[PDB]
Amino acid sequence: TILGFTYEIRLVEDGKYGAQDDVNGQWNGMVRELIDHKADLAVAPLAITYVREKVIDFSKPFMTLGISILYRKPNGTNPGVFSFLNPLSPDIWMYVL
Amino acid sequence: ALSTRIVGGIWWFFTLIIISSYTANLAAFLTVERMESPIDSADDLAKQTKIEYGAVEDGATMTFFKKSKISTYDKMWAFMSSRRQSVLVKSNEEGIQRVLTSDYAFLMESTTIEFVTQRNCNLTQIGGLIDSKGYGVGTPMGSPYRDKITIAILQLQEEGKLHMMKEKWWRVQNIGGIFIVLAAGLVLSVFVAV
Amino acid sequence: YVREKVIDFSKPFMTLGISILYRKPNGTNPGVFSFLNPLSPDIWMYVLLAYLGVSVVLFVIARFALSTRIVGGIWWFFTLIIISSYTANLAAFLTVERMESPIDSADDLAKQTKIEYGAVEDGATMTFFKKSKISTYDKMWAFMSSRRQ
Amino acid sequence: YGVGTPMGSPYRDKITIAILQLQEEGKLHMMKEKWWRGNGCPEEESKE
Ligand SMILES: C/C(=C/C=C/[C@@H](C)C(=O)O)[C@H]1CN[C@H](C(=O)O)[C@H]1CC(=O)O
Ligand SMILES: C/C(=C\C=C/[C@@H](C)C(=O)O)[C@H]1CN[C@H](C(=O)O)[C@H]1CC(=O)O
């Protein structure tokens, strides 16, 4: 609606957002897309990393991000009689009885 | 009768030392339960090598750890270098199931974690933000669209449409186990003679 | 040294250095109810109810002596359970605070990356962290450059 | 601690060069490592 283009959306087969090779120095996916101008744009959530920004141009950001720790809530602790009489053995309890 | 005195003194003695030993055992158990810190933040998992942690394999997360200089993040980097074939997964859902099944921590996008915790009650977000970056749209070098893309992103940010669109789219414990036993003791105290 | 090598100075009329300010943790609450912290109002109300019940029991025992000894022993061991639980809880969070080691060194702040730290931008502190050769202040410089804004 | 050089000597200028030389090389750091070193007897270890 802003720029007025006939946008075409299709899929890639490279399977990665873009990563330089460790010994070859070769990228893949969106980075080699925008080096060779195979497609004009790649609308994907991509962080503004300076290694990618020194290769291809990057736009100004529209939303923030952050690496966060993912975990669960493994909480039990059933409030019962057995939890109340926990720190002594029941054989000791019946021997005292 | 000195026999009754001896029996009462011995009975008070062993009842008091059983009560003291039970109090000491419960104090040690509660102190261990308090000392067991359940917080597993960035400073906690720097040295906790028992709990596995990592990220999606060859993503932007350890790319930030490729150039990290903080010794906690260097510890994370050395741990994922030591166990590269195990704790690294190709997709997000593999790490999600690794967190749900095994003792695993996963380091990925906070908005995705927020959406997953919105749609699943079985997961939590702990700690804060390790980094602080933004989403930049991928453009070729020297792109004439990219200037117009930057102007359009500024216009949509000043309009606030992206923020409200992101708002709509992809957003007694142990003391409680005490008074039940006391109520049962009250029930047994009622059923004596009345 | 950059300011001195650019332009001349006078004599330093006083000598100072860079140190660390932290907020003092005011986690202590009024001593009143402080020993009631291990105690539980809710279980406190429950024990009040239990005492009321024992009173009603004794009343019916005469208005409905081995049974009096049974009721007194049950109430006595019930209060002993209360005393042992409260003493265990109170010693537990008494040993929570005293086992804690607070911040007392710059190296502890270098290890603790949860607590944020920094200084004034374009000051002598970041100049000294730029010219820092000790690895502790180098990691300080790496942290404050990481949280650059 | 310093050196009591004669006044106007080039030893003061040599020490002034050496100050920046040791600061840029971190010689006080390895001096603290080497000679203010625990050769046995570390700090007060709390035994329970
Ligand atoms: C508090 C303070 C802030 C400096 C801010 C920067 C933006 C500046 O004014 O150059 C000053 C006080 N005098 C010091 C100085 O400039 O020598 C500086 C403190 C510091 O450099 O750490
Ligand atoms: C989940 C995700 C990517 C998925 C797989 C990785 C291996 C990749 O191809 O970058 C995205 C989410 N946004 C991040 C970005 O801005 O690139 C990225 C996270 C990551 O790469 O670790």
Q: Helix share of residues of chain A?
A: 10-25%
Strand content of chain A: 5-15%
Q: Biggest interface pair, residues each?
A: A-B, 54 and 76 residues
The main β sheet of chain A shows up as: none
Q: Topology as H/E string of chain A?
A: HHEHH
> Are any ligands bound, and if so which?
the ligand C/C(=C/C=C/[C@@H](C)C(=O)O)[C@H]1CN[C@H](C(=O)O)[C@H]1CC(=O)O
Subcellular location (chain D): Cell membrane; Postsynaptic cell membrane
Family (chain D): Belongs to the glutamate-gated ion channel (TC 1.A.10.1) family. GRIK2 subfamily.
Protein name (chain D): Glutamate receptor ionotropic, kainate 2
Q: What's the quick description here?
A:
The first copy, chain A, is an alpha+beta fold and about 100 residues long. The first copy, chain A, is about 25% helix and about 5% strand. The longest helix of chain A is centred in the middle third of the chain and has 7 residues, at about 30-35.
List keywords for this structure.
part of a larger assembly, 4 chains, 97 residues, alpha+beta, 6% strand, binds the ligand C/C(=C/C=C/[C@@H](C)C(=O)O)[C@H]1CN[C@H](C(=O)O)[C@H]1CC(=O)O
What does this structure look like?
- Chain D: This is Glutamate receptor ionotropic, kainate 2.
- This is part of a larger assembly, with 4 copies of chain A.
- Chain A starts with 29 loop residues before the first helix and ends with a helix.
- Chain A is α+β, with helices and mostly antiparallel strands and 97 residues long.
- Chain A has 4 helices and 1 strand; from the N terminus they run H-H-E-H-H.
- Helix content of chain A is 23%, strand content 6%.
- Chains in contact: A-B, B-C, C-D.
- The interface between A and B is large, with 54 and 76 residues.
- Strand 1 of chain A pairs antiparallel with strand 3 (123-126) of chain B, so a sheet runs across the interface.
- One ligand DOQ sits between chains B (55-56, 58-61, 92, 108-109) and A (16-17, 45-47).
